[PDB]
Amino acid sequence: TLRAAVFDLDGVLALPAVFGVLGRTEEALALPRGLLNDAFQKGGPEGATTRLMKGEITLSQWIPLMEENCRKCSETAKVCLPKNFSIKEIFDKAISARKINRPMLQAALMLRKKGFTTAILTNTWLDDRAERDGLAQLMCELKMHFDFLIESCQVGMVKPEPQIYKFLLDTLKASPSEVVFLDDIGANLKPARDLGMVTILVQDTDTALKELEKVTGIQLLNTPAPLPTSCNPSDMSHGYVTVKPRVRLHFVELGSGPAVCLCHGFPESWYSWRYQIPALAQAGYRVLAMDMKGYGESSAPPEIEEYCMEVLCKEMVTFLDKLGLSQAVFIGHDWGGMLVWYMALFYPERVRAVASLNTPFIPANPNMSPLESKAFDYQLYFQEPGVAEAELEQNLSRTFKSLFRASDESVLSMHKVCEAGGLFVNSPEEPSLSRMVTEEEIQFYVQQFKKSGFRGPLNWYRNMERNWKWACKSLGRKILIPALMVTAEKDFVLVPQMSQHMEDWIPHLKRGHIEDCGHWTQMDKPTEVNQILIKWLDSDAR
Amino acid sequence: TLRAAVFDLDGVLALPAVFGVLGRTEEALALPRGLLNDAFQKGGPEGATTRLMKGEITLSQWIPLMEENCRKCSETAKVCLPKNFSIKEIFDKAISARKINRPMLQAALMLRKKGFTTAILTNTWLDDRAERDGLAQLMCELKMHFDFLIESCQVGMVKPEPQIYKFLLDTLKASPSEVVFLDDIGANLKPARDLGMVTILVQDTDTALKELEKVTGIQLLNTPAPLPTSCNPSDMSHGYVTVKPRVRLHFVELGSGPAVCLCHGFPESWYSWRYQIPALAQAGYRVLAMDMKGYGESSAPPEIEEYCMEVLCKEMVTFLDKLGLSQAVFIGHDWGGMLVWYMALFYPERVRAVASLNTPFIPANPNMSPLESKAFDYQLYFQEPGVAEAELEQNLSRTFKSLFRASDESVLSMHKVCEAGGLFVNSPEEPSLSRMVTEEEIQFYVQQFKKSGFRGPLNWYRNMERNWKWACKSLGRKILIPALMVTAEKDFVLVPQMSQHMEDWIPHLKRGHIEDCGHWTQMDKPTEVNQILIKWLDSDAR
Ligand SMILES: FC(F)(F)Sc1ccc(Nc2ncnc3ccccc23)cc1
Numbered sequence A, B: 001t002l003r004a005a006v007f008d009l010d011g012v013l014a015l016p017a018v019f020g021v022l023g024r025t026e027e028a029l030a031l032p033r034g035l036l037n038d039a040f041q042k043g044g045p046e047g048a049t050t051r052l053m054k055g056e057i058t059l060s061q062w063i064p065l066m067e068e069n070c071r072k073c074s075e076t077a078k079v080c081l082p083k084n085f086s087i088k089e090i091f092d093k094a095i096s097a098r099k100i101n102r103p104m105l106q107a108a109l110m111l112r113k114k115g116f117t118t119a120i121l122t123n124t125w126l127d128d129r130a131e132r133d134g135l136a137q138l139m140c141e142l143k144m145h146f147d148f149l150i151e152s153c154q155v156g157m158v159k160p161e162p163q164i165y166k167f168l169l170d171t172l173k174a175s176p177s178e179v180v181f182l183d184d185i186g187a188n189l190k191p192a193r194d195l196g197m198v199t200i201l202v203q204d205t206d207t208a209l210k211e212l213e214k215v216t217g218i219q220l221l222n223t224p225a226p227l228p229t230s231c232n233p234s235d236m237s238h239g240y241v242t243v244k245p246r247v248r249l250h251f252v253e254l255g256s257g258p259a260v261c262l263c264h265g266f267p268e269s270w271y272s273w274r275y276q277i278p279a280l281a282q283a284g285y286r287v288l289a290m291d292m293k294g295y296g297e298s299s300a301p302p303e304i305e306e307y308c309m310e311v312l313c314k315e316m317v318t319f320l321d322k323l324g325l326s327q328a329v330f331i332g333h334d335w336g337g338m339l340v341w342y343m344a345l346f347y348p349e350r351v352r353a354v355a356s357l358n359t360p361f362i363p364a365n366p367n368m369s370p371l372e373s374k375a376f377d378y379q380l381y382f383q384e385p386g387v388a389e390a391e392l393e394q395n396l397s398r399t400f401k402s403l404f405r406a407s408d409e410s411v412l413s414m415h416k417v418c419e420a421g422g423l424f425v426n427s428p429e430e431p432s433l434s435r436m437v438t439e440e441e442i443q444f445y446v447q448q449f450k451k452s453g454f455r456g457p458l459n460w461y462r463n464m465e466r467n468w469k470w471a472c473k474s475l476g477r478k479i480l481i482p483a484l485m486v487t488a489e490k491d492f493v494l495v496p497q498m499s500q501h502m503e504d505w506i507p508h509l510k511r512g513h514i515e516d517c518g519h520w521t522q523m524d525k526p527t528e529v530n531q532i533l534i535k536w537l538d539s540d541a542r
């Protein structure tokens, strides 16, 4: 019975194999078969390559020691090497062209979700080339998905020496019979076999995965499309910025590159971006997922006037100021989307690009008050301080389970809430668990709302007149910075139709649409949200 | 009697003035004198420029409204405009060439340090150009140095309307006679004069500063070179990352660009980089100033083995991992410098570049143990757990005041500490305040050391044998990534002479030296530390 899975990097989790490139180069340069592979493994355990794999020497130290081993191997073959020949050049392209073997990672991901202890076991070197980052980036992406990463140059042992295999077992804290090992090299496979481990020779991913699903008894091949990588809250970098004496803002930060500021809606968290954070950071962006004023680990002042658009926006500018950021791309959902359009209209120099999910940009009516624009029953229900708070705070588990659901799961009514006297009047006390959320994921929102409740979040609805008077100062402006509007087909609050005239105020407005998507866009359709944002960020946000 | 200073931006805090460019363009393009300035102020308070300055319209909306005002102004002059004429092009270079007027900022800085309430009052626009960032960056740099920033396009009022002047007074909470106002335009100066404010017409910075120092009674012109901008701890963005179950790391983060990880020494704080943080962030870098393991807001496990180089380095790699950073440039001082050389030798793919202050890279002697390499009396004094802790924790104010001092202030003895039985045996109970530190700055270190004391910091000294055995695995390697060694002339612990053979292991090693500089490099010689690091970062770290 198995509980551990071990993968090699070269030829198993990463394709094409770097080793195979030594052969291709001989075939392309019409060099005697094996010339470069003879120079590679020259001296065996006493040779330059073993010293490199054990961490005795770095990659840049090995490069000449390989070139002179290419000089010794050609003397035996009598032929001479070309003019534009560079060992560095061959390895640079070889390492560069090597990309993650997505199906192999998917299988590793699936095994780990089924309670397997996963690990990478590779014969690698200490990379000190000018272009070492590409590989550091690759290793970063892979490693997060595994329990352990055993690099030969770190452990000082190497494959096929049996010491690394006993080290593998001691690390995994498991009996060899509880271990599946996968390698593309028979030699590096034999010692695992001898110890009593299940071994899979990798020649093609499909057969290798067949052998894996055969022995594990878990579906790994042909399995449905997996959800994007999520966030474990405790494994994140949490940031805190005091924007003013009583007001502190919290964010979760991930990645390098242009600053991408994510603004959640009502009643949410930075956690509502759980599937976007790893994805956007992987796309080469510095993700700053906010806890908006009144939410989670951010300050929740009681006063209503503390949550009008002007103060909220001015506070987000101070956030940039204190973090040392002249600009950030502002991506907002729901009330976050509203904030994000005001950031663009009042502080365009602070906004690199602006993106909204479901929330349209609707210019204020200077004649009619927003309390009339009745023309949203829950809005009126939220006006009275204390009422909605008491209902939403009554049972937190119930509140989120009732709210957080797909279009095909709808259990909540937005119509005639006031006359019936409650948001959950015609709702079960123990609602069913939605297909978008796990019990654990709902508990995160429960834990966060236990800090300061719904007063702060609900105050975002209690500044209609202030927001209206303020927005009226922007009636002569146009949003001319890069902008994206993302509509969700089945959002019955923020309907796609409401966005139709947006090009009248944003001429260069780019668009995105998601079919069969509810209000809770990010958790409903994550893969497509990420696809839309990455494509727009790469084209309009640098 | 004055207590408030008000500066304009264009022509006062920023030179050359954008307004003057309208004249230069006429003079360069041989256009009828004033043509572009007539088109600029066309329509007066009902014109496009006033609408722009009040925030009714953005800069990109105004650009055509100015081009057609250049078409109307040329009909009256009868001449026609050239082919390669662009209003956007003129303003782009105009805004770009406008840089901070350093002496004017220095004077504002000096007034604020003398207890003045400082403010910027400018007639500006909402900038939505593709190149708006340059100006956003400029505004960011200036604003941090002032109590208030009143932008016309934000307040909806403009100069010379008297409403903005009464708004200025209400903001400052001061009587007009307690206010010095400075502008390069007589018109925008008159309403301040009428209200009873001190006014200074700016035509040349020197005369303007003479008038300022005359009326304020404070030396502003010819004054000594000021210290670089420091950090107010509460105004910083504080980051927290759990690197393992019991271990959490804290850092202060500022700026955008390549990640620069700052590693302090013993017995220090992220605060030891107070003068480098704003400077390096201003140079286009993402500063991550660490609280090393055992210090400040970071976890301080009691066990000695928790502070050996291998665990400390492996933990800094997890920090990169959890933050989503494939690489960072590692700048270390004292024990931080040591860490930083091991980061380069064991994880070169994670290090963009490596820099050390005072700490040389000395390869371990594989024959002789480090306990012999006696050939550092305080080292032996730190070996016994509890002894040094009790002395250093006895009076925290005394401990830092005795330690943190310049070469010309030396009161502490490193020689014969063990036989005398104490670090502060021949030291006063109430030491004098060093020229490098303020009483407040010493209290910050006192407050931080009150959390977990000296056990954690002192354990960095208690792993000699482990560090030695580990370092011996790197004896075959060379540091081939960009590297900088910065020696401090008067450091009697980490002497410049000790660095002499460093090129034997780091051939491409770049160097920096600071004359008349003690051990506490960063606070001793900040301006020169920043000068050296920025110059090396810009050339070797991208
Ligand atoms: F009401 C609940 F919480 F039960 S579901 C729900 C219902 C509505 C919204 N968003 C907005 N509502 C009203 N004006 C807005 C204006 C701008 C953006 C969002 C909104 C969120 C959740």
Ligand SMILES: FC(F)(F)Sc1ccc(Nc2ncnc3ccccc23)cc1
Pocket: B265, B266, B267, B334, B335, B336, B338, B359, B378, B379, B403, B423, B493
């Ligand atoms: F000792 C005090 F704290 F009183 S002054 C003082 C004295 C010495 C150091 N640095 C180092 N000491 C010993 N080995 C090292 C090895 C590497 C780096 C620094 C060191 C710091 C402060």
